[PDB]
Design an enzyme around this catalytic site. Sequence first.
Site, mmCIF file in Angstrom:
data_model
loop_
_atom_site.group_PDB
_atom_site.id
_atom_site.type_symbol
_atom_site.label_atom_id
_atom_site.label_comp_id
_atom_site.label_asym_id
_atom_site.label_seq_id
_atom_site.Cartn_x
_atom_site.Cartn_y
_atom_site.Cartn_z
ATOM 1 N N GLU B 345 -6.194 -18.023 23.029
ATOM 2 C CA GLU B 345 -7.378 -18.501 23.101
ATOM 3 C C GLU B 345 -8.041 -18.199 21.855
ATOM 4 O O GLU B 345 -8.348 -16.948 21.602
ATOM 5 C CB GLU B 345 -7.984 -18.268 24.092
ATOM 6 N N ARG B 386 -9.517 -11.570 16.455
ATOM 7 C CA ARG B 386 -8.566 -12.000 17.136
ATOM 8 C C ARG B 386 -8.072 -13.155 16.024
ATOM 9 O O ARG B 386 -6.613 -13.324 16.346
ATOM 10 C CB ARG B 386 -8.941 -12.799 18.392
HETATM 11 N N1 LIG Z 1 -13.200 -8.800 23.569
HETATM 12 C C1 LIG Z 1 -12.733 -9.695 22.618
HETATM 13 N N2 LIG Z 1 -12.136 -9.208 21.569
HETATM 14 C C2 LIG Z 1 -11.846 -10.316 20.540
HETATM 15 N N3 LIG Z 1 -12.295 -11.392 20.379
HETATM 16 C C3 LIG Z 1 -12.719 -11.847 21.589
HETATM 17 C C4 LIG Z 1 -13.069 -10.875 22.732
HETATM 18 N N4 LIG Z 1 -13.804 -11.743 23.581
HETATM 19 C C5 LIG Z 1 -13.963 -13.064 23.233
HETATM 20 N N5 LIG Z 1 -13.370 -13.116 22.059
HETATM 21 C C6 LIG Z 1 -13.399 -14.000 21.074
HETATM 22 O O1 LIG Z 1 -14.433 -14.923 21.097
HETATM 23 C C7 LIG Z 1 -13.941 -16.261 21.674
HETATM 24 C C8 LIG Z 1 -14.872 -16.670 22.792
HETATM 25 O O2 LIG Z 1 -15.146 -15.898 23.932
HETATM 26 P P1 LIG Z 1 -15.681 -16.279 25.425
HETATM 27 O O3 LIG Z 1 -14.578 -15.471 26.291
HETATM 28 O O4 LIG Z 1 -14.895 -17.894 25.310
HETATM 29 O O5 LIG Z 1 -16.877 -16.641 25.649
HETATM 30 N N6 LIG Z 1 -17.414 -17.856 25.454
HETATM 31 C C9 LIG Z 1 -18.217 -17.836 24.255
HETATM 32 O O6 LIG Z 1 -18.497 -16.940 23.695
HETATM 33 C C10 LIG Z 1 -18.601 -19.087 23.951
HETATM 34 N N7 LIG Z 1 -20.229 -18.609 23.495
HETATM 35 C C11 LIG Z 1 -17.999 -19.792 22.911
HETATM 36 O O7 LIG Z 1 -18.042 -18.859 21.677
HETATM 37 C C12 LIG Z 1 -12.708 -16.028 22.147
HETATM 38 O O8 LIG Z 1 -11.871 -17.581 22.094
HETATM 39 C C13 LIG Z 1 -12.085 -15.045 21.354
HETATM 40 O O9 LIG Z 1 -11.769 -15.689 19.934
#
Ligand SMILES: Nc1ncnc2c1ncn2[C@@H]1O[C@H](COP(=O)(O)ONC(=O)[C@@H](N)CO)[C@@H](O)[C@H]1O
Lengths: 421, 421
Positions: B345, B386
């Site tokens: 993702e 990521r």
């Molecule tokens: N702990 C983490 N470490 C690294 N990248 C992360 C982490 N958590 C999330 N991401 C990145 O941020 C993206 C979106 O996080 P997500 O869990 O989908 O929450 N959703 C959002 O934040 C929405 N605001 C869309 O950005 C992930 O697809 C990944 O690219």
Amino acid sequence: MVDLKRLRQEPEVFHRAIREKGVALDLEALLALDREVQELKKRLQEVQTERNQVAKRVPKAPPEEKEALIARGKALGEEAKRLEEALREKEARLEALLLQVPLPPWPGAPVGGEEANREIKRVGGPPEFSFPPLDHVALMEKNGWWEPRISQVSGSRSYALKGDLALYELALLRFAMDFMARRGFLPMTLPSYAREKAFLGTGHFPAYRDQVWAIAETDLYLTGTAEVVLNALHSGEILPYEALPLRYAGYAPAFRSEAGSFGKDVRGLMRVHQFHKVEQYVLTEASLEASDRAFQELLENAEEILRLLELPYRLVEVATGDMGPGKWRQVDIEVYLPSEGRYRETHSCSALLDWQARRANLRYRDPEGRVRYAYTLNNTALATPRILAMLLENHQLQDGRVRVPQALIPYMGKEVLEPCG
Amino acid sequence: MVDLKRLRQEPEVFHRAIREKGVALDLEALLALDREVQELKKRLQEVQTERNQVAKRVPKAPPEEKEALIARGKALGEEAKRLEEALREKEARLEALLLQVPLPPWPGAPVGGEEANREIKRVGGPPEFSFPPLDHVALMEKNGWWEPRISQVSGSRSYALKGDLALYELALLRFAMDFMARRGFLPMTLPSYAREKAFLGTGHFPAYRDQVWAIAETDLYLTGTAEVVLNALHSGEILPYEALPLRYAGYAPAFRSEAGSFGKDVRGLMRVHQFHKVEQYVLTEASLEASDRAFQELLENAEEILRLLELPYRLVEVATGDMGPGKWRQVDIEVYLPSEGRYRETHSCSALLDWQARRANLRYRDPEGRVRYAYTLNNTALATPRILAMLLENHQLQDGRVRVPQALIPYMGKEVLEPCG
Ligand SMILES: Nc1ncnc2c1ncn2[C@@H]1O[C@H](COP(=O)(O)ONC(=O)[C@@H](N)CO)[C@@H](O)[C@H]1O
Ligand SMILES: Nc1ncnc2c1ncn2[C@@H]1O[C@H](COP(=O)(O)O)[C@@H](O)[C@H]1O
């Protein structure tokens, strides 16, 4: 942290340091405490070792003498836990105190507080505006470059930039990282949190504890400068001489509790809780001339960025009272802020000799195989949003738009910051 | 926060929604408490009224009818006390419960947990290598691109990037801000902390409270997404129809507690406590059509970014039990990660209709003059570190160096990421 050997041998040197730097520390009480710890480690030597002897005599002792020995053994053990636990309490007290001993400032440091600070040099001057200049908040308000609603979301001492200025913020951070990498510093993007040990290492704990935000339910603290992280990377490692000087350009978001109010009441872009900072960090060998050469490079780098930013600035020798416990020498770089008709700090260049190396345990193998505490230095490369306060005011045009300095036109795409809405 | 009026006439919809989304919510208990609260409020009406209209009859009443009215006043009075105690107590837990009611998933969402997520399409193939590929950690180790020592400074789930990859992390964030600005989104750089109210507004509190770090001795929490700040900006503001849709591209550092135990060795740049995220946020008018247009725009933007980054990706329709309580639709975008042979993702696109607008109180004046709750949507524009993992693995060369996508060469200054060592 100071060498307890030199502390014992020439405490008047540290006494002047505590006096002129204003550290609340009773050097005589510390010195006393040390004698007690020494004394108690020796007395504890006696009992644990007489106990060693009684226990050694026990295994073939005739039943009569065997129980005498158990009896004596018990009492001696009692004594030993009493002494043991006394030592631990006393040593914790000694260490905490040792953590407050300041480095002696350099001989030419102005003695006194901030008012003793001395302007070294001034390059460029207050702009002569063809029209009545706005302050940076009014430039932001007018061109729609910040989001005032951020205070309802995050609190005060917060900012959120918009449009061209959002972009400009980022361009200045990349610019500073590119400029540091062409000056041979190793660019690093770093986290904004560290365990306690890294704050102790720099000297931010204990004295500046007030200023750091803890992350609750973790053993993490958010850092006020990438320096807490850069300084702790090589703790416990012994560096090859051939690695020195380490020159790290570290970028990290910085977080400050900012427990201390703005007399020039509260806000704009000058003192916020969270900002972005590229830090200049150097670890060099334990010679004053290696330190002095690094300090001058740290300084010239910051001056160089201000010249490319086209800002009027001045350097200031920081007085003993104001440089903080671990500084040998501190020079701030202040940039002119038209709306306050005064210079404002944008950079502090400190040389701390081995005061942080003895705390963070940073060491190297000198050209002769001797292991030594390194010397450390640091200076800001560029911190936003604060220099944005000065770029906006010094570069504002008649119409309220802002010109971007020539060196930053490649990073922005344009010569003028356009309004948003 | 759902519309209680729909909750009362369509409870079966919400029941299907609670079951399919797997929310731990007793709907009969809620609707029951809702009826108790409505009858209490009606009853209090009835009390306060009769207590007024008999106190009118009382003062000078025929003496025998007067005491009956006094008696009735004593009864009605103690009943109002009781009605209010119960109402105060029952409204509180009903508000706490309403804060848990899920939005109905869009009809076309697979029903099931994470396993029912259907892939919609995939764009681009796996890279084909003239050599066996290295994983992104071996590419960073080999080239001296990250700093393993950060683990000791900051704990696990920390990264510290060095040299060209540090510079490449900043360049990617700027590219995503410029790509968004050019797509009409208003760029903003934001704080990474907000008050609890901003988290309740997005749905992060209560459901996800444990994924969020709090700043101790403070009423602030660190945001895991810029969406939390962006979404709280216009709270309590009635936006004019003409302002709409608000398209905001915000950048903030994101902090995540990552309290989700462990399983696969999700080490390297994949799951860290602190990362950088540029976010797409749209606040639009309350029609499905408006929302679907925005959703597609948000998705095409993240698709275009990934095309610019020359990365193979797939779109994934997230299932009801995996999208979360507030979502109407969630489509994850996954990039191929050659060392895992799987897609990971990178972006997650959500349409939330008015579920966050009702929590954060985001309203607008529609074209007829009616104040309606707006619809909100959001999608990642680009998150580091990521993406750097898929970028290193996908663009690695035979020598362990990595090409820079054409799009990013202007941001990088070079075509290939050079080693530090
Ligand atoms: N702990 C983490 N470490 C690294 N990248 C992360 C982490 N958590 C999330 N991401 C990145 O941020 C993206 C979106 O996080 P997500 O869990 O989908 O929450 N959703 C959002 O934040 C929405 N605001 C869309 O950005 C992930 O697809 C990944 O690219
Ligand atoms: N609270 C703050 N808000 C904005 N910038 C700050 C803040 N604290 C310090 N700075 C900037 O960071 C530089 C170095 O910080 P300091 O190490 O505390 O001197 C200062 O010169 C400013 O450029």
